[PDB]
């Protein structure tokens, strides 16, 4: 039950994170990333917004490099799940921390943006499911639940 609430919250955090990462890239375009569906009075918009802000220093440094490796990987609708799963599994093989959780959100954002830029529309909800389902089945949602939920990310 605790994990399922974290999974529901993860969908909101990821959609908010995407919205705010895209908006700050625009203020520093993917029309699929300009909508922010949230439940009433949700705190997860603030969580995603703060995570997009606090990772900006590192992300702005490496965005070009990450985009370049994605160009090399050439993800498509047919292989994106396999590649997402392998990369995310490796990311957490040696452990979980809040930084790596944010890196996973950033990977989902950059993957979604990359496929859209290469012509694959309608895929943002697919990547959202990949992120939520990975966290649920690979013990990340449990780790977050043990720290008090995603609201613990507001202290970062």
């Amino acid at each position: 039950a605790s994990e399922e609430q974290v999974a529901q919250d993860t969908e909101e955090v990821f959609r908010s994170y995407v919205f705010y990462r895209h908006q700050q890239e625009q203020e520093a375009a993917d029309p699929e990333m300009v909508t922010l569906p949230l439940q009433p009075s949700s705190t997860m918009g603030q969580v995603g917004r703060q995570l997009a802000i606090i990772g900006d220093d590192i992300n702005r440094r490496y965005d070009s490099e990450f985009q370049t490796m994605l160009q090399h990987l050439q993800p498509t609708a047919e292989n994106a799940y396999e590649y997402f799963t392998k990369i995310a599994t490796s990311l957490f093989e040696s452990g979980i921390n809040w930084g790596r959780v944010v890196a996973l959100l950033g990977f989902g954002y950059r993957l979604a943006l990359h496929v859209y830029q290469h012509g694959l529309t309608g895929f943002l909800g697919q990547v959202t499911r990949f992120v939520v389902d990975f966290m649920l089945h690979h013990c990340i949602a449990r780790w977050i639940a043990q720290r008090g939920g995603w609201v613990a990310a507001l202290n970062l």
């Binding site: 606090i54 990772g55 220093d57 590192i58 992300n59 490496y62 490099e65 990450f66 490796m69 994605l70 090399h72 990987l73 590649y83 392998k86 990369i87 490796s90 990311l91 040696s94 921390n97 809040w98 930084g99 790596r100 959780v101 944010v102 890196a103 996973l104 950033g106 990977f107 970062l156």
Partner: peptide
């Protein structure tokens, strides 16, 4: 799987760098 390994290693490094900064 060279590209997969490299992206995953970058993500862990960037994640650990962020975690240390926080």
């Amino acid at each position: 799987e060279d590209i997969i390994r490299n992206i995953a290693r970058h993500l862990a490094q960037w994640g650990d760098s962020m975690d240390r900064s926080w």
